[PDB]
Scaffold this motif. Structure first.
Motif, PDB file in Angstrom:
ATOM      1  N   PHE A 198      42.313  -0.512 -25.200  1.00 57.94           N
ATOM      2  CA  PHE A 198      43.653  -0.948 -24.799  1.00 57.94           C
ATOM      3  C   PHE A 198      44.506  -0.773 -26.032  1.00 57.94           C
ATOM      4  CE2 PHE A 198      43.709  -3.516 -20.809  1.00 57.94           C
ATOM      5  CZ  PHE A 198      42.455  -3.075 -20.367  1.00 57.94           C
ATOM      6  N   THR A 199      43.978  -1.257 -27.153  1.00 58.49           N
ATOM      7  CA  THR A 199      44.640  -1.162 -28.439  1.00 58.49           C
ATOM      8  C   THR A 199      45.056   0.289 -28.698  1.00 58.49           C
ATOM      9  OG1 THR A 199      43.163  -2.891 -29.194  1.00 58.49           O
ATOM     10  CG2 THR A 199      44.397  -1.726 -30.872  1.00 58.49           C
ATOM     11  N   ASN A 200      44.082   1.204 -28.635  1.00 59.38           N
ATOM     12  CA  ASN A 200      44.334   2.624 -28.880  1.00 59.38           C
ATOM     13  C   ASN A 200      45.340   3.213 -27.900  1.00 59.38           C
ATOM     14  OD1 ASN A 200      42.379   2.207 -30.777  1.00 59.38           O
ATOM     15  ND2 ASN A 200      40.930   3.712 -29.996  1.00 59.38           N
ATOM     16  N   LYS A 232      46.740 -10.972 -27.537  1.00 58.75           N
ATOM     17  CA  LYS A 232      46.844 -10.843 -26.086  1.00 58.75           C
ATOM     18  C   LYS A 232      45.495 -10.508 -25.449  1.00 58.75           C
ATOM     19  CE  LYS A 232      51.556  -9.746 -24.443  1.00 58.75           C
ATOM     20  NZ  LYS A 232      52.492  -8.748 -23.833  1.00 58.75           N
ATOM     21  N   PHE A 233      44.701  -9.649 -26.099  1.00 61.66           N
ATOM     22  CA  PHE A 233      43.396  -9.251 -25.549  1.00 61.66           C
ATOM     23  C   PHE A 233      42.350 -10.349 -25.667  1.00 61.66           C
ATOM     24  CE2 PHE A 233      39.491  -6.704 -24.872  1.00 61.66           C
ATOM     25  CZ  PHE A 233      39.890  -5.862 -23.842  1.00 61.66           C
ATOM     26  N   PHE A 271      48.602  -6.110 -19.998  1.00 63.25           N
ATOM     27  CA  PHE A 271      47.159  -6.192 -20.028  1.00 63.25           C
ATOM     28  C   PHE A 271      46.581  -6.974 -18.872  1.00 63.25           C
ATOM     29  CE2 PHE A 271      46.427  -5.197 -24.805  1.00 63.25           C
ATOM     30  CZ  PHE A 271      47.232  -4.080 -24.667  1.00 63.25           C
ATOM     31  N   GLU A 310      41.562   5.172 -37.358  1.00 60.53           N
ATOM     32  CA  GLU A 310      42.352   3.992 -36.978  1.00 60.53           C
ATOM     33  C   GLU A 310      42.163   2.832 -37.985  1.00 60.53           C
ATOM     34  OE1 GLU A 310      42.546   0.482 -35.133  1.00 60.53           O
ATOM     35  OE2 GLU A 310      42.798   1.207 -33.092  1.00 60.53           O
ATOM     36  N   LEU A 327      35.277  -7.631 -20.264  1.00 61.04           N
ATOM     37  CA  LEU A 327      36.392  -6.982 -20.973  1.00 61.04           C
ATOM     38  C   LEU A 327      36.184  -6.643 -22.432  1.00 61.04           C
ATOM     39  CD1 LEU A 327      39.425  -8.844 -19.438  1.00 61.04           C
ATOM     40  CD2 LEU A 327      38.475  -6.604 -18.967  1.00 61.04           C
ATOM     41  N   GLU A 328      35.146  -7.212 -23.029  1.00 68.96           N
ATOM     42  CA  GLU A 328      34.879  -7.021 -24.435  1.00 68.96           C
ATOM     43  C   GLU A 328      34.754  -5.610 -25.009  1.00 68.96           C
ATOM     44  OE1 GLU A 328      31.634  -9.907 -24.322  1.00 68.96           O
ATOM     45  OE2 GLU A 328      32.972 -11.252 -25.438  1.00 68.96           O
ATOM     46  N   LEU A 338      42.629 -12.733 -23.109  1.00 65.30           N
ATOM     47  CA  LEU A 338      42.105 -12.432 -21.791  1.00 65.30           C
ATOM     48  C   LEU A 338      40.600 -12.584 -21.760  1.00 65.30           C
ATOM     49  CD1 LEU A 338      44.338  -9.423 -20.814  1.00 65.30           C
ATOM     50  CD2 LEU A 338      44.723 -11.829 -20.486  1.00 65.30           C
ATOM     51  N   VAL A 339      39.966 -12.591 -22.930  1.00 69.74           N
ATOM     52  CA  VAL A 339      38.520 -12.784 -23.014  1.00 69.74           C
ATOM     53  C   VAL A 339      38.253 -14.235 -22.614  1.00 69.74           C
ATOM     54  CG1 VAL A 339      36.553 -13.065 -24.552  1.00 69.74           C
ATOM     55  CG2 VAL A 339      38.072 -11.119 -24.817  1.00 69.74           C
ATOM     56  N   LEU A 345      45.666   8.715 -33.808  1.00 68.67           N
ATOM     57  CA  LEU A 345      45.315   8.267 -32.474  1.00 68.67           C
ATOM     58  C   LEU A 345      45.512   9.328 -31.429  1.00 68.67           C
ATOM     59  CD1 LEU A 345      46.507   4.622 -32.192  1.00 68.67           C
ATOM     60  CD2 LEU A 345      44.177   5.487 -32.438  1.00 68.67           C
ATOM     61  N   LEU A 358      35.951  -3.164 -24.124  1.00 65.84           N
ATOM     62  CA  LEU A 358      37.109  -2.416 -23.680  1.00 65.84           C
ATOM     63  C   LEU A 358      38.348  -2.775 -24.492  1.00 65.84           C
ATOM     64  CD1 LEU A 358      36.431  -0.617 -21.155  1.00 65.84           C
ATOM     65  CD2 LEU A 358      38.169  -1.943 -20.025  1.00 65.84           C
ATOM     66  N   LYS A 359      38.174  -3.597 -25.516  1.00 64.25           N
ATOM     67  CA  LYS A 359      39.307  -4.011 -26.329  1.00 64.25           C
ATOM     68  C   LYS A 359      39.976  -2.901 -27.112  1.00 64.25           C
ATOM     69  CE  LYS A 359      39.914  -6.869 -30.362  1.00 64.25           C
ATOM     70  NZ  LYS A 359      39.732  -8.217 -31.018  1.00 64.25           N
ATOM     71  N   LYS A 360      39.219  -2.209 -27.958  1.00 60.29           N
ATOM     72  CA  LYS A 360      39.830  -1.187 -28.782  1.00 60.29           C
ATOM     73  C   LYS A 360      40.468  -0.089 -27.987  1.00 60.29           C
ATOM     74  CE  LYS A 360      36.633   2.572 -30.090  1.00 60.29           C
ATOM     75  NZ  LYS A 360      35.634   3.024 -31.103  1.00 60.29           N
ATOM     76  N   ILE A 383      49.233  -7.875 -30.060  1.00 58.04           N
ATOM     77  CA  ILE A 383      48.394  -7.175 -29.092  1.00 58.04           C
ATOM     78  C   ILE A 383      46.925  -7.574 -29.181  1.00 58.04           C
ATOM     79  CG2 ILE A 383      48.142  -5.229 -30.655  1.00 58.04           C
ATOM     80  CD1 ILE A 383      46.559  -4.064 -28.802  1.00 58.04           C
ATOM     81  N   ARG A 423      36.788   5.931 -22.154  1.00 59.91           N
ATOM     82  CA  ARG A 423      37.990   6.760 -22.202  1.00 59.91           C
ATOM     83  C   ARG A 423      38.365   7.326 -20.839  1.00 59.91           C
ATOM     84  NH1 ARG A 423      40.342   8.767 -26.387  1.00 59.91           N
ATOM     85  NH2 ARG A 423      39.989   7.942 -28.522  1.00 59.91           N
TER      86      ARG A 423
END
Lengths: 293, 303
Positions: free
Chosen positions: B45-47, A284-285, B22, A259, B38-39, A288-289, A252, B41-43, A281, B121
């Motif tokens: 936040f994860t990364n 959590k995302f 978040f 990943e 927000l979709e 929010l969706v 990462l 844009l998920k990975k 995590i 990014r």
């Protein structure tokens, strides 16, 4: 002192050798000897409950049966309500903590550390500090550690000294204090003195720690090198998850697709820290969706 | 103990995501870049989140590992200015390049996918020098200009016979995409030919010419020459298009009709893409992330 060898080989990760260092004590039954024999045995190809007679070794049997489930039943049952050895406790706390009962786990630990060196105490101490940190109580972890240290300043470090540094290490790792300095030299040395996953993996983290992806990378191709991924099949499979974890956290830092293909292994394989969190995590995302549609 | 020092030290998107906030992060991006979907844009936040945490193993191995945080700075620093580690332009660039790689390879779809990753990014980027914040933007600009350029050629391709009028229109707009000249060549060439298989030397001589004035000599270049000749021999208006080379306008990123200074337009807080007032309060077509029109306080990235 005495079997400082057996110990120094355990906390470094070569159970291969750790065992042969106990083989040397041709059947002199000592609780400490048992603990470590049992433990190295578990750490290797296979464990062999040696005597279900000892109100200790009988515990170990339990502990292991425990590891193959999640029932601390007979374990906690055939133990609680009667004052017992830290070594015995150690196994319980761990059991507990593996379940997630960290608050209690740590309690169990302190209860034992309270028999002030009644053999096994330092071993518990480490565990307490670890369990503490697992639950994020760095403050406590230190306090527990600090207060035991400046305490027994009677050069009692007859060998537990390296068990002690281990604890300190883990604390230093969380604090992030002297990550570059003294805490790096610690692992640095350890690795050079005992090349194993336990040590090499430690070093690895210290590197990721220091943003030095360069060096980190090397440590990885090395761990993939024939000598480690093949030549030591045993205490190499033991650490695969964690290894993978780091493989990711490094993959990462350089932003590599990997990943997936990577934590795909950890996923369809284990369910530890990295995945525990990765789950929370991910939820959590998606959570929010729902909240913004 | 840790995570806090971050939030306390910096309240920006990246750091919020990194520190695990978040909701706090989504909020900030609505106010500053008007992010709304927000979709995709998920990975990211994860990364961001996972990229600063690593695990050390804990003595009796069959015990959960231990967390460790990767700080963006070494020992010697304002015991305040303590922050998480985060990717950086180092990569943004890397990714941008794959866009160029794919551009050359004529794989439109993939090229786009790249640029977006770059845009995303940037959005969650965190920078040391005021200076780099500047570059982050230049990269960001360029990106949309490539997503745009491609978005057009891509749709010019998804056209059925007979729409001829529209096709030449797009092919010539593509030319407007502020890409590095070298890359704009491919655009110009596309335009140049299609305004020849359609007797339109009144612009063919233009494109082919605007091309030759960047590319000196090559197999392709040589054709562009021959095209400016047989075309500079009959000022033909076979098909009238809205496009006039000599004027100042931007191409609407939803319609692909031009926007002159006279035109009532609406921009996008993140991308900068401009559209016809028609499409206000809709999702921008560049990086399907923010609401067109909504007002933003501005994209924060400098620490």
């Amino acid at each position: 002192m005495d079997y400082f060898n057996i110990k120094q080989n355990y906390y470094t990760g070569n159970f291969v050798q750790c065992l042969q260092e106990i083989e040397k004590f041709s059947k002199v039954t000592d609780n400490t000897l048992l603990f470590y024999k049992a433990k190295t045995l578990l750490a290797l190809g296979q464990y062999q409950s040696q005597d279900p007679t000892s109100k200790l070794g009988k515990v170990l049997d339990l502990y292991v049966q425990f590891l193959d489930t999640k029932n601390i039943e007979e374990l906690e049952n055939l133990l609680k309500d009667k004052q017992n050895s830290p070594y015995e406790l150690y196994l319980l706390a761990t059991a507990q903590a593996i379940l997630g009962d960290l608050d209690k786990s740590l309690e169990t630990c302190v209860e034992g550390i309270d028999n002030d060196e009644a053999e096994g105490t330092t071993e518990l101490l480490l565990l307490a500090i670890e369990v503490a940190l697992l639950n994020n109580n760095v403050s406590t972890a230190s306090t527990i550690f600090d207060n035991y240290t400046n305490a027994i300043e009677d050069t009692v470090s007859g060998d537990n000294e390296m068990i002690l540094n281990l604890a300190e290490s883990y604390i230093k790792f969380a604090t992030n204090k002297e990550t570059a300095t003294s805490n790096f030299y610690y692992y640095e040395e350890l690795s050079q003195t005992f090349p194993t996953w336990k040590t090499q993996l430690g070093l690895l983290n210290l590197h990721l720690q220091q943003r030095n992806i360069a060096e980190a990378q090397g440590i990885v191709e090395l761990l993939l090198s024939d000598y480690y991924s093949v030549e030591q099949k045993e205490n190499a499979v033991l650490y695969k998850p964690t290894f993978l974890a780091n493989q990711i956290t490094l993959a990462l830092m350089q932003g590599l697709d990997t990943e997936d293909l990577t934590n795909q292994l950890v996923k369809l394989d284990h369910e530890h820290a990295f995945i525990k969190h990765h789950q929370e995590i991910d939820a959590k995302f998606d959570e929010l969706v729902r909240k913004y549609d | 103990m840790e995570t806090a020092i971050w939030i306390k030290n910096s309240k920006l998107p990246a750091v919020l995501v990194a520190a695990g906030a978040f909701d706090a992060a989504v909020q900030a991006l609505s106010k500053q870049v008007g992010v709304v979907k927000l979709e995709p844009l998920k990975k990211y936040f994860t990364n961001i989140y996972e990229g600063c945490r690593t695990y050390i193993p804990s003595t009796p191995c069959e015990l959960p590992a231990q967390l460790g945080y990767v700080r963006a700075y070494d020992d010697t620093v304002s015991e305040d200015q303590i922050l998480p580690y985060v990717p950086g332009l180092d990569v943004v660039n890397e990714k941008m390049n794959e866009g160029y790689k794919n551009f050359k390879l004529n794989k439109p779809d993939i090229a786009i996918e790249c640029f977006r990753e770059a845009i995303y990014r940037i959005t969650l980027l965190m920078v040391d020098d005021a200076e780099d914040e500047k570059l982050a933007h230049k990269i960001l600009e360029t990106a949309r200009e490539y997503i745009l350029g491609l978005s057009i050629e891509l749709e010019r391709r998804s056209l059925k016979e007979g729409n001829t009028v529209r096709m030449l229109e797009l092919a010539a707009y593509f030319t407007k995409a502020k890409l590095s000249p070298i890359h704009r060549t491919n655009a110009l060439q596309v335009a140049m030919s299609q305004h020849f298989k359609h007797k339109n030397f009144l612009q063919a001589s233009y494109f082919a010419g605007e091309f030759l004035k960047i590319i000196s000599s090559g197999p392709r270049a040589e054709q562009a020459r021959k095209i400016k000749n047989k075309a500079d021999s009959m000022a033909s208006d076979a098909i009238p298009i809205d496009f006039d080379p000599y004027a100042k306008f931007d191409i609407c990123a939803a319609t692909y009709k031009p926007i002159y200074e006279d035109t009532p337009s609406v921009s996008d807080p993140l991308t900068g893409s401009k559209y016809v007032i028609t499409e206000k309060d809709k999702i921008d077509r560049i990086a399907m992330i923010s609401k067109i029109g909504a007002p933003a306080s501005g994209l924060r990235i400098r620490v």
